[PDB]
Amino acid sequence: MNTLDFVDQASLRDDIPTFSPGDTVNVHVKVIEGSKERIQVFKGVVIRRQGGGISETFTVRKESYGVGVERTFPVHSPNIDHIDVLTRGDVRRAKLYYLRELRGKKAKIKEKR
Amino acid sequence: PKPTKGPRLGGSSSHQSALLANLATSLFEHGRIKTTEPKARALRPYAEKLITHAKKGALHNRREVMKKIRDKDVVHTLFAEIGPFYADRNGGYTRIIKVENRKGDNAPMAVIELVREK
Amino acid sequence: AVPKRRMSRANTRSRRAQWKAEAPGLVTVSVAGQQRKVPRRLLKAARLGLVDLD
Amino acid sequence: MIQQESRLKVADNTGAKEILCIRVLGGSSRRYAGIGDVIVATVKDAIPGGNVKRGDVVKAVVVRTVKERRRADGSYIKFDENAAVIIKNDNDPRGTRIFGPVGRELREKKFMKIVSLAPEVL
Amino acid sequence: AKRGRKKRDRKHSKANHGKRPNA
Amino acid sequence: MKVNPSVKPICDKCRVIRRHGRVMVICSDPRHKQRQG
Amino acid sequence: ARKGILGTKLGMTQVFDENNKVVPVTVVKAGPNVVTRIRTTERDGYSAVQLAYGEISPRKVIKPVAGQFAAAGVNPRRHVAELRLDDEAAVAEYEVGQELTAEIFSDGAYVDVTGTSKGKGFAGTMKRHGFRGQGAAHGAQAVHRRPGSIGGCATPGRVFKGTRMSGRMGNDRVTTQNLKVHKVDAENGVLLIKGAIPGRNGGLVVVRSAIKRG
RNA sequence: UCAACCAUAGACUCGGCGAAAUUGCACUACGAGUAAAGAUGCUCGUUACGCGCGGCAGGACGAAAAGACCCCGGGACCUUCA
RNA sequence: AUGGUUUGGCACCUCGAUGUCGGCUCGUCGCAUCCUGGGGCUGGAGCAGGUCCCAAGGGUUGGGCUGUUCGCCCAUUAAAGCGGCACGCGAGCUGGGUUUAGAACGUCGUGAGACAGUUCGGUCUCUAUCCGCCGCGCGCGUCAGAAGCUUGAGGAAACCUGUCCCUAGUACGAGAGGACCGGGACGGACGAACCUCUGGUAUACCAGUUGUCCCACCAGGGGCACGGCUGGAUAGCCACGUUCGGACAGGAUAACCGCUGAAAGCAUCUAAGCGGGAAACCUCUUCCAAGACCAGGCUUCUCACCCUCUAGGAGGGAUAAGGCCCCCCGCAGACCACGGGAUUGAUAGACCAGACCUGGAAGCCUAGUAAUAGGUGCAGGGAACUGGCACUAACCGGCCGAAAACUUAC
């Protein structure tokens, strides 16, 4: 419980799928380019799911054209059309910052079977 | 628990942990102990949480106690005739009683004791 | 640093008076029948018997 | 978060491999260059055969920052290298290609040619 | 300078009678 | 305007006056405008 | 006009606007305030409204305060405070016993929030006045955070009043100006105000209309 | 850049013991002046309820060391075709 | 002629000690204004300038070389001001230089040794008494004692500015080029508050893990090694973060533009009068503030007893309203103060639940020779955040604390 839960529950988004760090996802983020709303897919590994409630952020990492990229979205942001989980990851940590120094097969999360 | 805001009791976090362990050991061994007011104030949550572990009688709780106590006789006492004694009690296992100050340092003193009213 | 001059008696005493003691406020307690005076801080422990009343 | 004596990679094919910032433009005693912020730099490393050579003073635009930059939507964007594009005075690149992704802030800071040339604009 | 000027012009007073020490 | 301690006429049209405690010189030719200062 | 109200700060949070842009807000429990006295020029020399806020037991009230609230004709509250106005035409709206809620404001209004800053205790000149300290190396003998010079020399021979020195920071009245209310919530009786508010959570504040921006 | 945080020893508070350099005095303000030419102490004004605690170090030309630089006087040691 | 910042002259305080250059920190002042602001003249078409006047509110970058100040240079900038304050500031720092003792080069000197010549190296002491300054309390006073809310004399703070767009490629101009005025957006720097985000930190959080010792042993754990190290990390503190701010408007003015107008039949911004006019000034914004000794104001509460002196003026006691101390506490805090609470109670702790952090406990089972893995099981552990619960502790309580009247008017 918190003291502002009654304020946050309004903006609290349903349809947020249950995911966790290590889980690979596709975030369909709304992108505006000069009076033109489209959707960009940030496909990447969740390294982090900080926070609670409306303030909850999740950080998704990918390697685009030979460069690491991380997007820290709010979980209940309405700029996110949806989040499509693809693979769940077997990780022994809650925050996969060690991927920031790993490029390639070293940065391949163990899929959950 | 709510950690020590200020400087720790024994000039070190280590010596604070050791103090609290030894003082809880003594408190469960003897029922009451006289020490300084701050040491008692800090011990009361420590000891009450160990007693909570003792009320929740199970091996996990016994080991979570033994990682602080290290006196097996006191651990047994906790899990045999303290925890059960306080099964009906929802907290409030200890009371602090302010007493006369020392002479050599005028240190405020307090007797921290276990309650025995039920 | 050091004091430039001998402080006068007036000023010396003016602050030396501030080095005093606040006397403790006492209350009555009826342990062992007799009415003794203790601090309210120690009232409980005196009712119990943890207060050396000389 | 880029400042004087900060070394950046070059996300283009001018011949420069890395540069060193001198000034962040935007005002007086400007400290930090985020994405879309123009800088004055010098080429510290360059490929052997290149248009711009070692020691050439140039303008550049920052397109990747390690330090996460907020966005109005509450999101953030963070890369693993600080990288920039060398430009002319028309805010157009001196090179003809752009390596790696760039931030979307370039679109609002009017570096549309770089936005177009880049493979991914995030 | 101002200080010397003022101190000298002080001598132009009914009491000093146009003379003062160090003028 | 010229601001100098020596303000004086420059031509026959330049007239001298005392305005607001200041000696001014006025003229059709505004080049010849002057003020004491 | 400069309509206002007393409330309590509850904490900060996020919301999202129509553009999906994030708004850091502070939730202010702009609560049921009750008018307890009207200040007039014919009586007090100035135009103002005395408001009262905060539930309180009628036994924790000091009896003078009880008598004040009684002669007003209301039940006591914890905090009392005046809102200065500009004229009798502005004070004529407030009647004693009148109840003020968050609904006096409206979404998009600009407010000034007066609160009591958090206490930073006895602070050094760095934390208190943004002094650069001195070097942490290169010979510095024990001046790594010390203010350095304090005045001139003999010619001044003194330290000027108002010099910036170490001391207690915080617990000072702070008016943050031109905060845009993101939302009113009369059901809960609160205001979502874009951005920081002075004080701790649970701290009393005064949300007034912005004296600059309407 | 540009500093933030944590602990510890001090500093702070309580108890106990208990110094020091210094000291012409004293109920030791500020300005502009004046003055052995840089004033707490004088003049004209301004300001200031009395007493403490923690702090800072601009002044008390602060303490310390009868300035080592300079000069005068005297020594000492050194040099040399004195 | 100013000024007194340069080199100097004098040698007036200081040689029973006034520490020196430069830098760092902290500033403060002047304006002889670098920018911003206002304006006159122009050989001012416009952009941009030049020159002069008013203006000191704010701002006036970071680097390379050098001990350096200065200067040159690099990039920038709206601008990269000039000076004073013991060439501000060493009981605030440095100590690279100068300016001890060592050594060396060059030169001088027979030599010892010397050099506003160079070179390498080379102890920066002091517990703050007074003033002052920053903050915080105690006492008394403000004609009874108290309480709440306040006024605002008087002070403090803040005061910066660019780029782009439209106006308009219009005015102007052969063109090149290119506006004033006025609107709009986005910014830099500075500052305040805040911690929802991000990010840092986390010495009683979680996990892993090395070495070693111990809990008899396995298992599980603990002590120590910078919290042993690592990986993460809620609160709080905080900035790199968030938000906000500088205003608008008015008055009076400077330079300046003027009107009506004489003296002086004209003319004249002035002598009587009337106006306009700047980031300066006063107002405005924020903050402190009635010790504002004219010690304020609006209200509310108590608004009542005894004793002794010989009842004169007092003194002592007990009280009320109320407050203090003790007590539980705080995101309040050096102490003190402040704030809250105090059994007619959720103030703290415990407990319960949640949130959050960690990330899947122990035990048992299963698979595997084993290392280990999987299930039981968003497990277990756990601090600050929230909410519930009087279980513990806020006590069977002590100390302070209230009225001479008089005069006049109504």
Are residues A65 and D100, on separate chains, in Cβ contact within 8 Å? yes
Q: For D92 and I82, how far is CA from C1' in angstroms?
A: 43
Place of tokens 């001139």: G152
Beta strand pairing status for A68-74 and A80-87? unpaired
Residue F27, Cβ density class (10 Å: 0-12 exposed, 13-18 middle, ≥19 buried)? middle
- Of G2, G81, G71, G84, nearest to G44 (Cα)? G84
The whole-angstrom separation of Cα G103 and Cα G123 is 40
Identify the helix (H) or strand (E) that includes residue A63: strand A57-63
**CATH assignment of D1-122, among 2.40.150.20, 3.30.420.10, 3.40.50.10330, 3.50.30.20:** 2.40.150.20
The angstrom resolution of this structure is 2.8
Which residues lie closer than 8 Å to D22 by C-beta, 6 or more apart? D4, D39, D40, D41, D42, D57
G-chain CB neighbours of A8 within 8 Å are: 13-14
Which of G31, G180, G27 shows the shortest CA–CA distance to G104?
G31
Residue E2: strand, helix, or coil: helix
Q: What is the DSSP string of G127-159?
A: HHH------SSTT--S-SS-----S--TTT-SP
DSSP codes joined into one string, chain B: ----SSS-TTSSHHHHHHHHHHHHHHHHHHSEEEEEHHHHHHHHHHHHHHHHHHHS-SHHHHHHHHTT---HHHHHHHHHHTTGGGTT-SS--EEEEEEPPPSSS---EEEEEE----
CB D30 within 8 A of CB D117: no
Instruction: Residue G10: count other Cβ atoms within 10 Å of its Cβ.
Output: 20
How many other C-beta atoms can be found within 10 angstroms of the C-beta atom of residue F19?
9
Which residues of chain G lie closer than 8 angstroms to A74, CB-CB? Answer: 14, 22
- Please name the residues in contact with E18: beta carbons below 8 A apart, sequence gap of 6 or more: E11, E12
Q: What does the alpha-carbon distance between residue D23 and residue D33 come to, in Å, rounded to a whole number? A: 9
Residue D118 per-residue DSSP state? S
* D76 in contact with chain A, both atoms CB, cutoff 8 A: yes
Chain A closest CA to G181's CA: distance in Å? 14
A35/A13 Cα distance (integer angstroms): 26
Residue type, B3: P
Chain D closest CA to A84's CA: distance in Å? 18
Q: Tell me if A3 and G185 make a contact (CB, 8 A cut-off).
A: no
Q: How far apart are CA A107 and CA A100, in angstroms?
A: 9
Token pair 């079977």 in the structure block, residue: A113
Judge whether A13 and A34 are in contact, CB under 8 Å: no
Collapsing DSSP to helix, strand or coil, G167 comes out as strand
- Chain C positions touching chain B (beta carbons under 8 Å): 41-42, 44-45, 48, 50-52
Q: In what order do the strands lie in the sheet with F15-19?
A: F2-3, F34-35, F22-26, F15-19
What do you get for the CA distance between the two ends of chain A, in Å?
A: 34
- Tokens 């930059």 belong to D69
Which distant-in-sequence residues (6+ apart) come within 8 Å of A61 by Cβ? A44, A45, A46, A47, A68, A69, A70, A96, A99, A100
Q: How far apart are CA F34 and CA F22, in angstroms?
A: 10
Of the candidates G81, G82, G80, G87, which has an alpha carbon nearest to the alpha carbon of residue G1? G87
Question: Cα distance from D18 to chain G (closest Cα, Å)?
Answer: 32
Instruction: Return the amino acid letter for D72.
Output: A
Return the number of other C-beta atoms located less than 10 Å from residue F21's C-beta: 6
